């Protein structure tokens, strides 16, 4: 019985493209989309830097997955909560590579 | 995209982790100039699966406290942002090296 841990992500951002409803035969259907968040930070005129971070979002939960596929659109502003999962997988070599996603379990439509 | 592409419109990129440190922290330099403290953090889900996070500490002061006080087996709460650390490996393949850039660390053990 392992002790309690936490793996909790909160994002609020704009969706990068229309979601993909993905059923790679075997694993159950998943709604996939991307979420952009911007980080602004200072560095004549006021010199300020900006970086856009592109998150891959997966929705497995059965009711939320369908709501996500039908209502998330390109440009949609949303808030979401989930956990980070790195998607380890063996490639053609004898080691592992990562495919990081945020597994959303809660989505709030802000638009 | 312009200089007028200010994107004052705000967003949120926030992660909270509570778990156990996998190994003693190490110290690296990124590009030629930015010292960083790096360690691993394990979190678990009931469902089982141990999820292994790469933690990077860039903040000055925090990075030194982390390096001196985080130890293998330390229990840690931390907060920060996700950076996916995309790069090109040896063979032009685009890889991810996802890290949580911690801006707050609370020591529990």
């Amino acid at each position: 019985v392992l002790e309690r841990s936490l793996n909790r992500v909160h994002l609020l951002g704009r969706v990068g493209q229309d979601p993909v409803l993905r059923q790679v035969e075997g694993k159950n259907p998943v709604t996939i989309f991307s979420l952009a968040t911007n980080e602004m930070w200072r560095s004549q005129l006021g010199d300020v830097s900006q970086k856009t971070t592109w998150h891959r979002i997966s929705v497995f939960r059965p009711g939320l997955r369908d709501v996500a596929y039908q209502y998330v659109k390109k440009g949609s502003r949303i808030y979401l909560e989930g956990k980070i999962d790195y998607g380890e997988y063996m490639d053609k070599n004898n080691v592992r590579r990562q495919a990081t996603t945020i597994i959303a379990d809660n989505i709030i439509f802000l638009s | 995209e312009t200089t007028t592409s200010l994107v004052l419109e705000r967003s949120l990129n926030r992660v909270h982790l509570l778990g156990r440190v996998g190994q003693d922290p190490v110290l690296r330099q990124v590009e030629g100039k930015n010292p960083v403290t790096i360690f691993s953090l394990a979190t678990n889900e009931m469902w089982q699966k141990t999820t292994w996070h790469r933690i990077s500490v860039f903040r000055p002061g925090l990075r030194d406290v982390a390096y001196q006080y985080v130890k293998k087996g330390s229990r840690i709460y931390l907060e920060g942002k996700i950076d996916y650390g995309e790069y090109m490996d040896k063979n032009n393949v685009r890889r991810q090296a996802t890290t949580i850039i911690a801006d707050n660390i609370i020591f529990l053990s």
């Binding site: 560095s43 005129l45 010199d47 300020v48 830097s49 900006q50 970086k51 856009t52 | 995209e1 200089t3 592409s5």
Partner: peptide, 4 residues
């Protein structure tokens, strides 16, 4: 202005 700076954009990564």
């Amino acid at each position: 202005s700076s954009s990564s």
